[PDB]
């Protein structure tokens, strides 16, 4: 819960295969500076949450051209992905498209 706004990273791409299995992360905004921009997330996540070695997982900003971010729903880079000052209910979404099928 978030007294401003809250927003949701999770994995979907078999991406959180790379974190042993979890793909939700609940994340909330403090309510002055929110400096959980998805590029310091993607950071905590790499840092913190890779079971793997980051190789095969995203550069460390946004994404790679493998992984592809969904911004609450959106094509992240066209929205401003790595540097984002979070929006609302932002289901912010990895989809690793280096594998589809």
């Known amino acids: 819960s978030a007294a401003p706004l809250c927003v ?3 994995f ?7 974190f042993d299995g979890v793909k939700k992360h ?4 403090p309510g002055q500076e929110e400096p959980w921009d998805i590029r310091n997330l993607l950071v905590w996540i790499k840092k913190n949450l890779l079971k793997e ?3 095969l997982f ?5 994404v790679r051209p493998g992984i592809l971010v969904l911004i609450n729903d959106a ?4 929205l401003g992905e790595l540097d984002y000052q ?3 209910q932002d289901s912010i ?7 589809g099928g």
């Open 53 to 55: 070695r980051p190789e």
């Open 58 to 62: 995203i550069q460390g900003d946004s």
């Open 86 to 88: 979070l929006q609302d």
């Open 12 to 18: 979907g791409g078999g991406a959180e295969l790379l």
């Open 75 to 78: 094509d992240w880079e066209l």
């Open 93 to 99: 979404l990895f989809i690793s498209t280096l594998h």
């Open 26 to 29: 609940q994340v909330a905004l």
């Open 8 to 10: 949701k990273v999770e």
